Structures are given as structure tokens and as C-alpha cells.
Amino acid sequence: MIDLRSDTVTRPSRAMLEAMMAAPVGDDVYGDDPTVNALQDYAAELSGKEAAIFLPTGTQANLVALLSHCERGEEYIVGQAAHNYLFEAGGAAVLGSIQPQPIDAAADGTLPLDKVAMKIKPDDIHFARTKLLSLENTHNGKVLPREYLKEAWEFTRKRNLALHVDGARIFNAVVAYGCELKEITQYCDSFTICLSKGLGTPVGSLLVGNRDYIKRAIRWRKMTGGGMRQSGILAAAGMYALKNNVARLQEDHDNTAWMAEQLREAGADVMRQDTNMLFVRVGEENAAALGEYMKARNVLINASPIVRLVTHLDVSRAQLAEVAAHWRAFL
Amino acid sequence: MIDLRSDTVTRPSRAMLEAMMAAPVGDDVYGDDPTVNALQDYAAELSGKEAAIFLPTGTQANLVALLSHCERGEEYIVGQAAHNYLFEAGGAAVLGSIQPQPIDAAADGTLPLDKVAMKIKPDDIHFARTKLLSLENTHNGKVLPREYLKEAWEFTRKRNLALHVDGARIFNAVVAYGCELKEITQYCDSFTICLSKGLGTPVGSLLVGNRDYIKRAIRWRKMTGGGMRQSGILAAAGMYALKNNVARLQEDHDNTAWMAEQLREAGADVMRQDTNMLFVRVGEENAAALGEYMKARNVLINASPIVRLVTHLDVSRAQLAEVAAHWRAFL
Amino acid sequence: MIDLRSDTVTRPSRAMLEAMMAAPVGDDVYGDDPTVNALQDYAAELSGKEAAIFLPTGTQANLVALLSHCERGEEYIVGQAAHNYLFEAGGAAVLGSIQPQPIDAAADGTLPLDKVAMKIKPDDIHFARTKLLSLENTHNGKVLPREYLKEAWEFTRKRNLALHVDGARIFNAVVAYGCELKEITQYCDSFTICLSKGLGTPVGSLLVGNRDYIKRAIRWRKMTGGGMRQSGILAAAGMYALKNNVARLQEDHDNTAWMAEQLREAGADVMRQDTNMLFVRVGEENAAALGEYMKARNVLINASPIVRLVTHLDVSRAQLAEVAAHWRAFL
Amino acid sequence: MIDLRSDTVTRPSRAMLEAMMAAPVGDDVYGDDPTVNALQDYAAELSGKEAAIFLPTGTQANLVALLSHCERGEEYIVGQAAHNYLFEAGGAAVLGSIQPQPIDAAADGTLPLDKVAMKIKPDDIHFARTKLLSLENTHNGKVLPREYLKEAWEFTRKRNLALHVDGARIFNAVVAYGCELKEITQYCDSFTICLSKGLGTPVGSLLVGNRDYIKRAIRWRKMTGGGMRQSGILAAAGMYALKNNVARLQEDHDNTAWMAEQLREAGADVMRQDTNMLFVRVGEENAAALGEYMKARNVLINASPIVRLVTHLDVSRAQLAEVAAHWRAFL
């Protein structure tokens, strides 16, 4: 019904499913799928990069990204709450033999460069070998400052460190900046793009970067099990998504901001609104009862002291207004 | 438009496509996709197993299968020419920290148990820990003797070893046996099922085993990158294929044996002659040219001193007759 | 000839040397070395543990300790500045496939349990599996409060977590506590003991724990490369040191606090003041020159903005007085 | 008493222990130990290599050698019965993420190059990336043909593959060839040297090779836990061993050959004699009883259908004659 748990729940639109059914395909392992190739060349050109690769999930996109950047024994500085450190079951370490070096992100979602600098290991056999700095744009909805993005870029060049950006929700930051994707991707060596969240595809993600870089990524994609066959049927949804579902993300943002106020006037404690995300401190009491009370009207959220509500193309404001009524009535 | 490179090139049928678009989906990460669940239960019920899991590729199906069976430092005995040892870039060792103990398969495609026994490491700190015997049913078209299957199952039990079967083309074996899937699946703790080859799906594989075993498989799938969202659309295909594309596999088999005689009468040296696979001894660089001659006539093959012709539903006898005609030509 | 770089520079004493040469050996791989066995039993009996194992280094002692405790994909919480996370080139992750979850230690050198609890991963497929809490007693000279030790032990049990203590200098802590080793060892499932630092051995460390735990440690030691032969000669040293070099550690402590006052009265900015370690705030490149000034006078230190002076049995108060004299000089 | 189990049991001679007690030492981590350095420069110059490194065991020497040659995902072609594949608990794979590719050695102990060639993986994302070829000279006593050694050398250069030689018993082959060590080490990029077997040191091994190569080896030695402190006391035994215990290995060889005949005339079935090794097929009956019968007179061998007797400096011919009497009497 009304799912406010994540934007990963968005479903294929009629026009999308059709484009998926009319897509010409080929064996992607042999690199013969027209659609996959098409989706990749497009992504690479829109971002100003040389190559791109389609993957099953964003989790594999990041695992492959990390393996491509870091050899056995190297490390990547990242956030304590970042997806490719916290939410990917420790894969970079467990499977990739890469040393992780996490640090608390600043309140704004960036990684203080002064702190990043303190974590850069001296070239001594006691330490892992620092090699990469991984960011996450839209970090829990948070849009990273553009001045920071430029600064992280310069800093890594000065330290001869790669810079990767987990862009599961990069177009959300993009619509928010009001600029072209290229303007922000010029500040990284590689980044991912998820198609199965706000952009609304059934499955799919992209890793983009330098030609040689992507070349190595291919070997890892195969090893990890991401080398599909006629995956052009999926890449097709991605293309339709990047050409029709980007601008409208501003609608999710406006709704999140609308809901935030409604909830305010409803009595709910609104902690933070950012892009398609809002946070309500519901408390330990009313928490569980909240999930149950909402689940009854077919309203699905992740019960918790602090609830994270996420808006997407499959949730209108009218539906939000209704959810609001139910929240105001929960009191 | 005639592809004999592999059965992985098969494209969706009209029927399949409509079944895919007409399918209900949901976030599989939450287990909310009814189609993924139905595919998994149908597979499980069909082979007499408790549980099944959907994966992007057979490569990830095996890596996950091996990870779920072998702990860090444990070992698996497998064939020098088996897919999960030779054709998966050594993932089990590279990513999973599992020692591989490969041995040559006999001519019938099985692993001589006397050799397997000689490879079981004593419980001594010099050795890895033999944990699993992995087999591959349909091995390069070869169908393992049902007698051996039983022997291997009994052998492992007696030696407290787990048994896994890579069934990328197990249905080709089933059809060749003339029995039910469960009659052969009974001799393995876990087995894999590829839907993207002969069954004609665009993507996907299944790993089938005990409930606890499969539960571990789920964590590994996630870490490896295969935890997709709306896999329903993809699962839908697998459904249609398992109910409508198994039996016809007989047609591919007949075509392979039909073509063997065509190429024989032509002048080619047909070496082997199994299910949907055909092996011809072309000889050096009279083959790298064959790939040219055939490519020119819109006939796609995998040029090599020993060519491997693979049949499937996207190749007909009429087209096969054309290849035999074109083949005999340059001779 | 005055080394304050570390207590790892200590050289064998006359007494120690004769004990080494006068020792009976045998192939430890077969457990045939009476001296290795006696060292291992003495350590075990002394700390109230079932078993102990001899290792080449403390680095291998920890890597093995972590491997024996954590399976592939499991995780350990540790301090951002702990040896087995920061000073061992990330081995636990790189070689053992264990996810590291580091956190900043409080000023007293402990890991705030509230922070540790916040890091325990829920049993969800996105997360690694929190298995162990690793501590480091004597942390850079700091002696952890006995109260905390008990707290950590209780905390872990309640949360079903294992507890390991890196005791490279645990005897420095013991002497500082004024209690018996077993009175602090009781609050950990496993702990390590370095014999090559303050105790004055040329090489070696011990890992102490349960019999089953240590049994696993033995396989890992072998694979890691520490299964030596006639380790008896080396074990002999450890024996002598544990019975003749523990108590004197008080002398190093007094010298450190004596020197703190010497350098204070001189003009240096003594920052910290713990067991056999001393920290001075030198300031940038007025330090890279200090290393020159001192090196010139046969005084070996580890030049740095924040110098770390370490005392041991191969440095006397007389020599310390000389350094204080030479230090005040260039000021 | 009379140990014929292995040559690893040899004990330090009086002159050796003394050289160990008089050796000047330093912290090897800082690279200040005079003796270690001395032992390394000597080994490197005698073999015609640029650098050398001392390690705790030969097992770590090989693990480090493999990690230094192969990055995550690469492979090494080696023997099914080779030490760094079979007797090192699968470390190259388990800890190093290196794919192992074993093949049966020819009867003479070499690895047929024609078979090595068939195992070299094409540069395709399906395969691990072949990088190294590892040999073992003196393989179970067997001295590898010199023409073969030269051939393997050329072959690897033609295929751009590294060539490593596990020389745990290299000086045994050397004394047997009648040439200088350099003449055989010129045919490899790197090799190990064990000091704790025929050469008779308590502990110790060496990895030798190119400067850059050894440099990387150091990082791995630290990670694995082989970076010791005042290990000059051990390296000292090595030096005394390479300058006094090499020539006399011809005495072990002569004795092995003497024993082989005695046992012949005694009634024992002598299968093979090679350097300091002899093999007797004792059978499944008389096997266990043999170990017990011998263990009674203080004669230690490894009971088995086929017994491997190893001679060393701690076993005279007179002792062998006595062992022979006991074997002849066992009938």
C-alpha cells in the first residue's frame, strides 16, 4: 500500500516494463548485448568518464569498485556509517583482503579531511597501505557540500590517493545541486549509480570510471558472480529511467518537505529532512505500537525510536496526507 | 543469426516475455517477491529439498555454494576441468579462502573415488581440511552414470564429506536419464540449477539444499552482491522455463546427434557426441580460419583446434543443415 | 649505546644466555621440546589458564589469536590505535578475512563500553558478525583500571562476546597493580605475553587460553609460519625472564618517572607519564633535529613531534641522567 | 636415541651453540642486527642474488615467497605433492588469496613442461591469472635433473612467468651435483634455504631473490609474524652451518646408500634411495608392529606400509648398522 520504508520498493512503470520487453539483447559476457552497452556508454558520457559497467546490485558495484582500487593489503578510508563499510557485511575485508579504516563523518555527512589526513599511513611495514578514500553522496539523504567535494578531490591528488563516491542516490544530490552530474563526478576517479531506488528500476547498478579501471572491474564482476548473459532486459529499464525519472525526483523532495511540516503540525518530533528522507524521533515507548498501528492501515515504516521515512515515485502526497492523518491520530 | 558458441545465447520466447511482464514483484531483500518465492519453492519441491535461493549467475551460485560448505582453511576436491575450479577465476580460493584440491576426471566425466580417497587429508596441521566433494552433472555434455552418483553419495557419507553438484545443465542429464529430477538429486546435499542456458532464461541460477545450509547461502549471496530487489521479473522467466522448456531439451539432443552425422558425412572429424554438445577436431589454424569462414556466413562459433558446437532452442535442424553445408564447403 | 627507541632492543643477559645454551631441545613440531613445554605450562599455570603456545612474535601471537577467535566474516571491535588493528598491517582483515570494527579509546586507554555496545551488529545479513572485543593492557604505557577489566569481562559475557587482551606488556601492568597475573587474567578468555620487550628475551611471545582454543591456535600458527623446531633455546630465555625479570620492571617505572622530572626541570614539555613509557611534546622539526643532536651523542631515539621515550633494563638512571643532560643542552 | 624420522631433528653442535652465544645482535625490525644482516648478505652472494631474508620457518619462507610473487587472484603452478601446496595447510590460498594449480610430478621429481604449458591460463576473465611456477629441488630426496632446471628457466622466460624453487634441501642437491649453488640458483628468480634440517640449525630459513622482490617479502614477513627482534642469535647458527656443515652432507648420502644395501641383505624391500633418504616397503601387516618393535630399542621411524628413513649429522653408520641388525631380526 503505502511503503515509507525505503525507495528500493519502487516498482517498474508500465512504460518501463514495455521498454524492457522491446529491448534487443545479446550475451553480455561476450559483450554482445546492445542495450547493456548502450546504457553503459550513456552513463559514462553523461558523467564525463571513459567507461561504465552494469552490475546486479549496488553492493556488488562497491565490492568490485574496492577490489579494482585496492590490492591485497591496501586500505580505504571511509565512514563508520558508510554503506561499503557498514552495510555490505564487511566484504572489502572478508572477500577482498582490503584493510578498512573508518572514521566518524561530520554532522554534514562529509569526512573531515584533517581527520582523513591523520589516518593516512606512513610508508612503514607496520601499516596497511592507504590507497583510497571512499565517500557517500547523499549520505542518509544528506547532500554533500560542493566545496567539500572539490576539496576532497584536490586533497587526494596531493596525497596521491584515489577518490571513489558511492552514488546509490547521486541523482538525488544532483537534482538538489541544480547542476549537471558531470560537474560533481569530475571530483572523483570512480562512482556508482543505483537504478533501483528513486530512479525506479527493478534491479541494477553502475560502476563508472577510467577505461583501465573498468577493465579490471570486469574481472572482479565475473569472480563475484555479476557477469550476466542477456541482462539487456534490465539495462533497458535503466536507460528509460535516466531519461525520464531524474527530474521528477524534485517531487519526492518537495513531498518529504511537505510531510515534515505536516508531521510537525501533527505533533510529531521532526529531527531532520533531507532530499527524499525525513527523521522522526518517536521514542521507545510508542515505537513498536507505531509500527503495529501503521501496519494495520497498510502503512509500512521501520518502527524504531527514530524513524526514517523515505519518499519515492510510488508514494503521492495524497497518500502522505493520509499517513499524516494516521500519525496525528496515533496521539 | 546462427549461434553455436553456447546455449547461454538463448533469447526469451514470446510466451516467456509475457510471463515476465505479467509478473508481480516486491523487494526480495525483504522476501516480499511472490514470484521469487514461488520459483524457489517449485525448485525445492521438485528436487526434494527443503530450500532454494535465486542468484544472478551460476558463477555466484557456486561461489556461494562453496562458501556455505567450506570454512576458512577447509578444502574441496573437484575436477581439474570443472567450472567452479577452473572457469570461475579461482574465486573459492581468492575470495573465500578455501583450498582447492583438483584431480583429473575420468573419460566418462566422473572423479574416480579411489583418487578422491587418496586426496582426503589426514587430520594433521600440515594439511588443509577436506570438507567437500564437488561434482558437475552434465560435464561438457557428458551425463554421469547414475550408478556413480549413488556411489559418490555413499562414499562421502561414509567419509563424512559433503557433496555438491554443479547442475548448470542437470536437466539435460535428467532428460537423458529419462527419470525425475528428485531421483538424481537425492545423491547430493546441495546442487545448482542454471536457468539461462538450455532452459532459455535471460539470467539466473538456483542453489538448492537444506534450510540451514541455504540460510548461510543468503548471507554469502548478500556479501557477494546478489541480493537483488524486484527479481520477480527474472524469476517469472525461470518459472515458465521449468514447466515448458525441460522436455524439449530432447530436441537439442537429437539435433546434436543429427549434426554429428552431418559433419561426419561432410568430412569433419567428429570427436565427441553427447547431449546438446558436439566436439570436432579441426586442427590448428585451419580453425582460426574456420571461424572466419563461418563468421562470414553469419555462423557464430568458438574457433579452436577442437571446436565445441553447442545446440539449444535458438538453433533449428534447418539452420544446423546450413552449417553442415557451409562446413563441408571449405573442405 | 643508549637506546630509548623501545624496550624491544633489550639484549640477553649473561645469566639468560647460559640458561639458553644449557637447555635441552627437540622437534617442537612433534611436541618433543621439554623447554618449550615447560615454558608453555609455566605461563598457563601462572595465569590460571588451561593451555599456552609459543610464537616467533607478538604480531603472530595476535593474528593467530584473532584467527582462532573469528571465522570468515566474523568481526572484532578494537581500538583505533591498538597494535593488532593498526600496527600489524591489517593482517586480521588481509590474511584472515575478519572485519575490523575500530573505535577511539578513552584517555585512560580503555574502550568505552557504551561505544562498544553501539557497535555490536544486529543479526542481519547487511552486517559483519561481531564476535570479539579485543583489549590491550598496557596501552602505550597506560595501565587499564582493574575496575574496567572486570566490567569488560562481564559486559562481553552478557553479550555473548569473546574477550582477548594483547598483553605485550601485561607484566608492566601487573607490577603497577601490585597483584598476581591471574588476578587480572581472570577477565579474558585469551591473552598474549611478549617476552622480547621488558622481560628481556631476544625473541618470542605466548598466547594463553582454553585448551580447545589453543588447539585451533596451533593449526593457524603452522599455516602462518611459526611452527619452529628446536625452539627450546628460545623458550629457555623466556623461562629465565619470567622468574627473574618481572619484579625489576619496577626499576624501569621509577626511572621513567625520574626522567619525567629531569626533562621537566631541564625545559622540555613532558606530556605523559606512565609505567616504562614517557611522552615529550617536542614540536615540529625541532625534533627531526633532536634525533640528530641525540644520534650524535650516541643516544638513539625515535625522532618525532611527540617523542616516545621507552625505558628497559638496558638503560640505567646514570645513562638517563646523561640524556637529560644532553637534552637540556640544545635548549 | 636413533631418530630416522626426519633430518629436522638434528641438534646444535657444541661449536654451533657457542657461535650462537657469541653473536652480536640488534633489533632486526630496525635492521640493526649485525649477524642476521651478515647471514643474509652471504646467502645472497653465494647464490648470485641481490638480497636475502631470514625467516622463522621454511613454511613462512614459502608463504612469503608466494605472496611476494602473486597478487590477489594470480596463480602458481606447482606439484600435487609439493610442500608449498600440500604441506603448508593451503596457506597460499587461505591467507594469500592465490589460486593454486597442481599437477603430478614426473617420476624423476620434475614437472613436465608440456603439462605446465597446458595449465597456463589464457588471458580471459574466466581464469585465474597464471604468474608463477614453483619447483622443489630435492623433492622427497630426489635431485632434479640439471638439464631440466635450465629448461624450466627458459620456458618461464618465454612465457613471462616467475620461477621459484623451494630449496628446503637445496644444498643436498648441490653436494650431489658437485657444482656451486650459484650454478643452479641462476635458473630461478627466487628460492628458499632451510637451515634446520641437514645443515643442522635449531630454527631458521632464508628467502633469496631480487632486491625489490625481497623488499616486498619484508612487508609480508611482518604481517605473517616473522619479523623478529634480536634474531641474530639464530642467524648465527645459520652462518656456522653454511661454512661447516655443507660438505659433510656427502656423509649422510653415503650412509643412506650403505643402509639401503644393508637392508637389502637383511631381507627388507628397498624401493628407492636418493640423497639422505631411503624407502622401504614394509607392508600393512608388519607396519605398526615395526614402529613398536623399533620404538622399543629407542629407534624412531614413521611406521607405515612404506617407510621413509632420513639420515643426518646426528646418526652415524655404526648406529645405522645397529638399526639394521634390529630390522634383520624383525624377521
Ligand SMILES: *[C@H](NCC(=O)O)c1c(COP(=O)(O)O)cnc(C)c1O
Ligand atoms: C541501498 N539502500 C538501503 C536503504 O534502504 O536505505 C544502498 C546501497 C546498495 O544497495 P543494495 O541493493 O546493494 O542493497 C549502497 N549505498 C547506500 C548508501 C544505500 O543506501
Ligand SMILES: *[C@H](NCC(=O)O)c1c(COP(=O)(O)O)cnc(C)c1O
Ligand atoms: C620440511 N621438512 C618435512 C620433513 O620432515 O620431510 C620441509 C619444508 C618446510 O619446513 P617447516 O619447518 O616449515 O615445516 C619445505 N619444503 C619441503 C619439501 C620440506 O620437506
Ligand SMILES: *Cc1c(COP(=O)(O)O)cnc(C)c1O
Ligand atoms: C555456464 C556455466 C557456469 C556459470 O554460469 P554463469 O551464469 O554464466 O556464471 C557454471 N558451470 C557450468 C558447468 C557452466 O556451463
Ligand SMILES: *Cc1c(COP(=O)(O)O)cnc(C)c1O
Ligand atoms: C611490540 C608490540 C607488538 C608486536 O610484537 P612483535 O613481537 O615485535 O611482533 C604487539 N602489540 C604491542 C602492544 C606491542 O607493543
Ligand SMILES: [Ca+2]
Ligand atoms: Ca526499485
Ligand SMILES: [Ca+2]
Ligand atoms: Ca540465455
Ligand SMILES: [Ca+2]
Ligand atoms: Ca583468501
Ligand SMILES: [Ca+2]
Ligand atoms: Ca629484546
Ligand SMILES: [Ca+2]
Ligand atoms: Ca581476506
Ligand SMILES: [Ca+2]
Ligand atoms: Ca634442526
